[PDB]
Amino acid sequence: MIREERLLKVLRAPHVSEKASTAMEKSNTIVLKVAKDATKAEIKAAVQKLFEVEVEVVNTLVVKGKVKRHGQRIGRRSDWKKAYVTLKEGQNL
Amino acid sequence: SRVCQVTGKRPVTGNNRSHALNATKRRFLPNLHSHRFWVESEKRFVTLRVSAKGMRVIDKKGIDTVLAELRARGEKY
Amino acid sequence: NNRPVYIPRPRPPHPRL
Amino acid sequence: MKAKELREKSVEELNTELLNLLREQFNLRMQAASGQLQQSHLLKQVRRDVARVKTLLNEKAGA
Amino acid sequence: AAKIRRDDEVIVLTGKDKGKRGKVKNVLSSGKVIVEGINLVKKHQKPVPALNQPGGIVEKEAAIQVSNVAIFNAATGKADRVGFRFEDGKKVRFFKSNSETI
Amino acid sequence: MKRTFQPSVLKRNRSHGFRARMATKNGRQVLARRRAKGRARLTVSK
RNA sequence: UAAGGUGAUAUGAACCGUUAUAACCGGCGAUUUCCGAAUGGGGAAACCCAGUGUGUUUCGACACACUAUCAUUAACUGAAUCCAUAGGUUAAUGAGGCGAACCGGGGGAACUGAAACAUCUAAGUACCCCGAGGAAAAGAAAUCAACCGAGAUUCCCCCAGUAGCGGCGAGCGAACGGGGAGCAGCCCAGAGCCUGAAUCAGUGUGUGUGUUAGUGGAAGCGUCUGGAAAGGCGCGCGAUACAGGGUGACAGCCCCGUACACAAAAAUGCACAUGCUGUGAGCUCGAUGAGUAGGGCGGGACACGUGGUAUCCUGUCUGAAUAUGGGGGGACCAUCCUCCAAGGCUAAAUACUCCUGACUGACCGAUAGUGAACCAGUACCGUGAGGGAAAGGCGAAAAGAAC
RNA sequence: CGAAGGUGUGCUGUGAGGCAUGCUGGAGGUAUCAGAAGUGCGAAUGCUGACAUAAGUAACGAUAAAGCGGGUGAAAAGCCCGCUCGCCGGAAGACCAAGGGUUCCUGUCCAACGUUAAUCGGGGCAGGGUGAGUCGACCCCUAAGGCGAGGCCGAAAGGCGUAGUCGAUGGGAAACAGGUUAAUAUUCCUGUACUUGGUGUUACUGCGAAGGGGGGACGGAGAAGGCUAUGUUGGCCGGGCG
RNA sequence: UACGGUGCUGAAGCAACAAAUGCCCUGCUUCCAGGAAAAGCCUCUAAGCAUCAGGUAACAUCAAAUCGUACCCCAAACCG
Incomplete structure (x- = not known):
C-alpha cells in the first residue's frame, strides 16, 4: 500500500498572508x-x-x-494549488 | 486495384505516338474480368479477378495448382 | 530597423493619351 | 551510510523508509516554508537517504 | 595529480612580488591559487545594512596563476620543480636536484 | 471594418492543431519538416 | 582518480570531505511523470473517461497488471443446408513510427535549347510514392569474338566526340578491344550407395588485439628595460619530448601536454583454437525450368527517333521444338562458330556521412564564415504552409570606483 | 627606449606609389626574389548600418468643457480630496460569451513607455488575489459533418463507406436571500432549501435488455384574456419650516 | 476616527391605479412553404433467474470527484 506516503507528499507548505490570517481567526x-x-x-x-x-x-x-x-x-x-482547509470548533494549530 | 490475381499483370504507363509523332502519356490496362471458378477440392466456387491470359493458364494448368501457387504468394482469394 | 514592408500601390497617373 | 542497511530485511528497511518520510521529511519542509529552518543541508541529506533506501527495496524485492 | 596543494610553502616566480615566500590558502578550479600576504588588493567594500558593515577599504588576497609559483625546497633556499613517484603503491611528490621526499 | 483574422481557439486547433496535422500524411510531413528545422513551437497550441 | 567539492548566468547561505563509502570520470544496473507509432476508448498533443484480473486501515476508497490494429501459426467454437466453409474467441510470434545522403523499383514534368516552334532537346533530371541494407543493385554466359581466341558482375583510365542516331537541325553518342582495382563460385527441379562427409549458421570456453576511465613522462639561472617578461645581454642543461595550448610582452628547460614506456574489476568489437545444436560431402544413374521462346497489333528500353533495324521488356491476341533440339553472331538466307533461356543464392573492387575521434588548410576572421562565434532557428512577421533578423571584444587580475 | 591601425608634417618618383618623422595606439609586423588571388569602386531607382536635409516646420488622433481651493511633492492646467460647471443616460451605464492571459488589488519607483509635464497609469519592481454536489465545462444523447474494424475501389499515396466512434451552435438531476475582503463569492459566512447515486436496516413484491410502445418532439403570422417585473399617487413613519 | 471609516441602535414597511417586447403560451385561432435527431424519463416483455438476485416504499449513513472562477469584454485590455 502506498496511500500512506502519498498523504505525506500532497502537502507542500502553508500559505501566509493577511487573507490567510483573517480566514484563520474568523472562519477557523x-x-x-x-x-x-x-x-x-x-x-x-x-x-x-x-x-x-x-x-x-x-x-x-x-x-x-x-x-x-x-x-x-x-x-x-x-x-x-492552494487549499482552504476548514476545521471544526476544536483546533490545535 | 486493377491487378490480375494470377499472372500479376498491372496497368503499365506508356505513350501514344500520333501521326505527327506527338507524345501523350496513356496507360494500358489489363483485360481483367471477375470470374467464378469451380474447385472440387473445396467443392465450391471461388471468385477471382483474372485477365484473359490468366484464364488461359488456369484452363491449362490445374485449378488446384494455381490456387496452391496463389496461397504461397500470400494473396487471399 | 526593418525596411518598409508594405508599399502602397502608386496613385494612378493622369491620362496622357 | 550505504551498506549499513544493505543487510536489513524488507520489513525493517521498509519501516525506516516510512520513518524517513514521516519525520525529518515532512517536518523539515514545513520549517523551511515557515522560515525557521536555519540549516538547509538536512533536506538534501534526507532526500538522498530516501532514494538510497528506496533503490534497495527495488533491488531486493522482486529481481 | 596537482603539484600545488592545500598546505604548501611556495615562492613567487613572476609578478610584482616575485621572490616572496608564502603558504597557499586554497586552489581554484581555474588553475589559480590564493596565497596570503603577497597579492594585496585594496577593494572598496560597498556598505550594506546587513549583519556585516565593514565598509571602507579591505585588503583582500587576489588569486594568481599556478604556474607563477613553485614549491619552496626549504633546504637549498630556492624554487624547485616537483614530480610524482610511486612508493609502496602510494603516489607521492618529490623535488628535483637531489630529489627528496616531501 | 471586420479584418480577416477573427480569433477562435476551437477552430484554430481543429485546423492547424497537432491532432489535425497527424491525421493526414501531408501534415505528418509538415511536422517532420518543422522538427528538422528545429522550431521551438512545433505547432499551434495553448 | 582524489583534496578538494555542492552544473552555469552568479556572488552568497547552509554543509560534505582531506587516506579514503566528498566530488569528479568509465563499465554494468536501478529509477525513468505526461504527450508522441501511442497501442484500453476518445480527444482541441502534453487531456478526458473506462472494463477485466489480482491485493488492501471507516461500506467509504485505493495499489499493481492487462485490455489497439494488422500478418502468420495453433487451439476452442461455429451460420445460411447434413457434412463443410466463411465467421467468432483465445494464445504465441512479428510488424507499425522516426532518420542527412547514398541504393532499387513504381510514377513523372515544365521552363530551357533549336536564336520561332510541334519530332527532338531539357530528361528519365526536379518532384511524389514504395521497399531494403550498411552499402544496395547487378552477377557464374541461351555472352563476346572470329572462324585466332577470350571465360560472372561492378568500378577507374583508354578506345572516343570515333562508328552511328538525328526536323541528318539543335543535340545525343556507344561497342569490340586494350591497361588497372578486386577475384568465388554453388544449389533446387531425384532416386540409390556411402552417412556429422567438408563448408556454414546459432551459442559456450580459452588465446591475441582493439574500444569504453587512466598513469609516469626529462631539462635555467643571473642581470638590463618595464606595471608585469617568456624579450635584450651572459653563461648552462634535456631532447626517441622545440607537435600545440596557457602563463602580467615572444618559453625546448613555469604549468597542461607531446615523444616514449605502462595499465581494465566490469562490459564489448575483431582475429584464432576448442565443444554443443541445426542444415549438409562424395560416387552412380537420370533429369535438365510451356503458356515460355517465337509471331500479329500498340508502346518502352537499348547511342540507335521505324528507318533496310538486329537485341531486350511489356499491354493485347496467338503459340513451338525440347536435345538426332534450341538461341545468338545487327534485315534476311545458307555454311560455319559459339552458347543452353523460360528456378534461385553469392563476399570483395564501388557510392554516400545525420553521428563520434584524431589531424590538416597559400580557407573565413564578426556586413566575412553555417541563417545563428553572445541560452538562433530565438525575437519578430503570417490563419497556415512558411519566412526570418540584429547583437562578439574593459583589464594580467574586478582590484567594477569606499568616502 | 613602442608593431599594425589612426592623425599630421616633410621629402621623393612620369604615374599607380614609396620613404622619414611628430601625436595617438598598444602587440604584432615583414625586406628581397618567387607563387597563388574573394587583388583596387563613384554611380547599377545597388545591399546593410550611421548621419544630414526639409525643420524646430506639419502635427500632438472627434469642437462633451472646464474653474477654483486644499493636500502630497524638488516641481501640479493633467495626480488625490472638496465645492461648482459640462457630457452620456436602449449608453459613452450595468452583467456575460468569444478573444485576450495578470491588464485585477496593495506597497514602491519615474530612466524607457504615455504623441506635453507627471508625484499619475493598463509603465518598471515586489507581495497579495480566482474557494462551488446546485453556475459553466467535463459528463449522458444526438444534428450538419468528420474519422472509420471488415468491406468496395484505386499504379503507390490514397478515395468512398457499413457496424461503430466522435462532433453544441441543441436535449438531459439540483439554491435562493442577506452580510463580509484593498482585490473572489449564487463558490466564503449566517438563515432556509433541493437533486442524483452507493451502503445498511425494516415492510412488501416477480425481476429482467443493444428489443417494442409512449414521451421527449418542435413552423410562420395574428389576436384576446389573466398576471408579474416595474412605475405613479395616496396613506403611514422619520426629519425640516428655511 | 491611524480622520479613509469603524462600532452601536433602528420607526413605518400598507392600499389604489397604470402596465409590458416578460410569464400563462412547447397555449389558442389561422396560413401554406407543412415546420430536427437521440438519450435521460415512463411502460411491456424475450433469454435467464424466481428459499436468490432484483425492484418498490420508509429510515439511517456516506459520496457528488476533476477543470474554469481575477480583470477587460461596443473597448486604452479583443480584431485593425
Whole structure:
C-alpha cells in the first residue's frame, strides 16, 4: 500500500498572508499549499493524519503562475494549488 | 486495384505516338474480368479477378495448382 | 530597423493619351 | 551510510523508509516554508537517504 | 595529480612580488591559487545594512596563476620543480636536484 | 471594418492543431519538416 | 582518480570531505511523470473517461497488471443446408513510427535549347510514392569474338566526340578491344550407395588485439628595460619530448601536454583454437525450368527517333521444338562458330556521412564564415504552409570606483 | 627606449606609389626574389548600418468643457480630496460569451513607455488575489459533418463507406436571500432549501435488455384574456419650516 | 476616527391605479412553404433467474470527484 506516503507528499507548505490570517481567526480555516493534483480527498486525509485534527470540508483552487521579466529574458512562474482547509470548533494549530 | 490475381499483370504507363509523332502519356490496362471458378477440392466456387491470359493458364494448368501457387504468394482469394 | 514592408500601390497617373 | 542497511530485511528497511518520510521529511519542509529552518543541508541529506533506501527495496524485492 | 596543494610553502616566480615566500590558502578550479600576504588588493567594500558593515577599504588576497609559483625546497633556499613517484603503491611528490621526499 | 483574422481557439486547433496535422500524411510531413528545422513551437497550441 | 567539492548566468547561505563509502570520470544496473507509432476508448498533443484480473486501515476508497490494429501459426467454437466453409474467441510470434545522403523499383514534368516552334532537346533530371541494407543493385554466359581466341558482375583510365542516331537541325553518342582495382563460385527441379562427409549458421570456453576511465613522462639561472617578461645581454642543461595550448610582452628547460614506456574489476568489437545444436560431402544413374521462346497489333528500353533495324521488356491476341533440339553472331538466307533461356543464392573492387575521434588548410576572421562565434532557428512577421533578423571584444587580475 | 591601425608634417618618383618623422595606439609586423588571388569602386531607382536635409516646420488622433481651493511633492492646467460647471443616460451605464492571459488589488519607483509635464497609469519592481454536489465545462444523447474494424475501389499515396466512434451552435438531476475582503463569492459566512447515486436496516413484491410502445418532439403570422417585473399617487413613519 | 471609516441602535414597511417586447403560451385561432435527431424519463416483455438476485416504499449513513472562477469584454485590455 502506498496511500500512506502519498498523504505525506500532497502537502507542500502553508500559505501566509493577511487573507490567510483573517480566514484563520474568523472562519477557523487554514490555507496551505498542496501538490499539483492533490485531490480534495487526499488533502482531507493528509490533514487528518499529520495534524490529528478534524476538518469540515476542503475546497481547493489553482493559482496560475505570473510572467516575470528577469534581465533580458522572459520567464513564467510555476503553477501551484492552494487549499482552504476548514476545521471544526476544536483546533490545535 | 486493377491487378490480375494470377499472372500479376498491372496497368503499365506508356505513350501514344500520333501521326505527327506527338507524345501523350496513356496507360494500358489489363483485360481483367471477375470470374467464378469451380474447385472440387473445396467443392465450391471461388471468385477471382483474372485477365484473359490468366484464364488461359488456369484452363491449362490445374485449378488446384494455381490456387496452391496463389496461397504461397500470400494473396487471399 | 526593418525596411518598409508594405508599399502602397502608386496613385494612378493622369491620362496622357 | 550505504551498506549499513544493505543487510536489513524488507520489513525493517521498509519501516525506516516510512520513518524517513514521516519525520525529518515532512517536518523539515514545513520549517523551511515557515522560515525557521536555519540549516538547509538536512533536506538534501534526507532526500538522498530516501532514494538510497528506496533503490534497495527495488533491488531486493522482486529481481 | 596537482603539484600545488592545500598546505604548501611556495615562492613567487613572476609578478610584482616575485621572490616572496608564502603558504597557499586554497586552489581554484581555474588553475589559480590564493596565497596570503603577497597579492594585496585594496577593494572598496560597498556598505550594506546587513549583519556585516565593514565598509571602507579591505585588503583582500587576489588569486594568481599556478604556474607563477613553485614549491619552496626549504633546504637549498630556492624554487624547485616537483614530480610524482610511486612508493609502496602510494603516489607521492618529490623535488628535483637531489630529489627528496616531501 | 471586420479584418480577416477573427480569433477562435476551437477552430484554430481543429485546423492547424497537432491532432489535425497527424491525421493526414501531408501534415505528418509538415511536422517532420518543422522538427528538422528545429522550431521551438512545433505547432499551434495553448 | 582524489583534496578538494555542492552544473552555469552568479556572488552568497547552509554543509560534505582531506587516506579514503566528498566530488569528479568509465563499465554494468536501478529509477525513468505526461504527450508522441501511442497501442484500453476518445480527444482541441502534453487531456478526458473506462472494463477485466489480482491485493488492501471507516461500506467509504485505493495499489499493481492487462485490455489497439494488422500478418502468420495453433487451439476452442461455429451460420445460411447434413457434412463443410466463411465467421467468432483465445494464445504465441512479428510488424507499425522516426532518420542527412547514398541504393532499387513504381510514377513523372515544365521552363530551357533549336536564336520561332510541334519530332527532338531539357530528361528519365526536379518532384511524389514504395521497399531494403550498411552499402544496395547487378552477377557464374541461351555472352563476346572470329572462324585466332577470350571465360560472372561492378568500378577507374583508354578506345572516343570515333562508328552511328538525328526536323541528318539543335543535340545525343556507344561497342569490340586494350591497361588497372578486386577475384568465388554453388544449389533446387531425384532416386540409390556411402552417412556429422567438408563448408556454414546459432551459442559456450580459452588465446591475441582493439574500444569504453587512466598513469609516469626529462631539462635555467643571473642581470638590463618595464606595471608585469617568456624579450635584450651572459653563461648552462634535456631532447626517441622545440607537435600545440596557457602563463602580467615572444618559453625546448613555469604549468597542461607531446615523444616514449605502462595499465581494465566490469562490459564489448575483431582475429584464432576448442565443444554443443541445426542444415549438409562424395560416387552412380537420370533429369535438365510451356503458356515460355517465337509471331500479329500498340508502346518502352537499348547511342540507335521505324528507318533496310538486329537485341531486350511489356499491354493485347496467338503459340513451338525440347536435345538426332534450341538461341545468338545487327534485315534476311545458307555454311560455319559459339552458347543452353523460360528456378534461385553469392563476399570483395564501388557510392554516400545525420553521428563520434584524431589531424590538416597559400580557407573565413564578426556586413566575412553555417541563417545563428553572445541560452538562433530565438525575437519578430503570417490563419497556415512558411519566412526570418540584429547583437562578439574593459583589464594580467574586478582590484567594477569606499568616502 | 613602442608593431599594425589612426592623425599630421616633410621629402621623393612620369604615374599607380614609396620613404622619414611628430601625436595617438598598444602587440604584432615583414625586406628581397618567387607563387597563388574573394587583388583596387563613384554611380547599377545597388545591399546593410550611421548621419544630414526639409525643420524646430506639419502635427500632438472627434469642437462633451472646464474653474477654483486644499493636500502630497524638488516641481501640479493633467495626480488625490472638496465645492461648482459640462457630457452620456436602449449608453459613452450595468452583467456575460468569444478573444485576450495578470491588464485585477496593495506597497514602491519615474530612466524607457504615455504623441506635453507627471508625484499619475493598463509603465518598471515586489507581495497579495480566482474557494462551488446546485453556475459553466467535463459528463449522458444526438444534428450538419468528420474519422472509420471488415468491406468496395484505386499504379503507390490514397478515395468512398457499413457496424461503430466522435462532433453544441441543441436535449438531459439540483439554491435562493442577506452580510463580509484593498482585490473572489449564487463558490466564503449566517438563515432556509433541493437533486442524483452507493451502503445498511425494516415492510412488501416477480425481476429482467443493444428489443417494442409512449414521451421527449418542435413552423410562420395574428389576436384576446389573466398576471408579474416595474412605475405613479395616496396613506403611514422619520426629519425640516428655511 | 491611524480622520479613509469603524462600532452601536433602528420607526413605518400598507392600499389604489397604470402596465409590458416578460410569464400563462412547447397555449389558442389561422396560413401554406407543412415546420430536427437521440438519450435521460415512463411502460411491456424475450433469454435467464424466481428459499436468490432484483425492484418498490420508509429510515439511517456516506459520496457528488476533476477543470474554469481575477480583470477587460461596443473597448486604452479583443480584431485593425
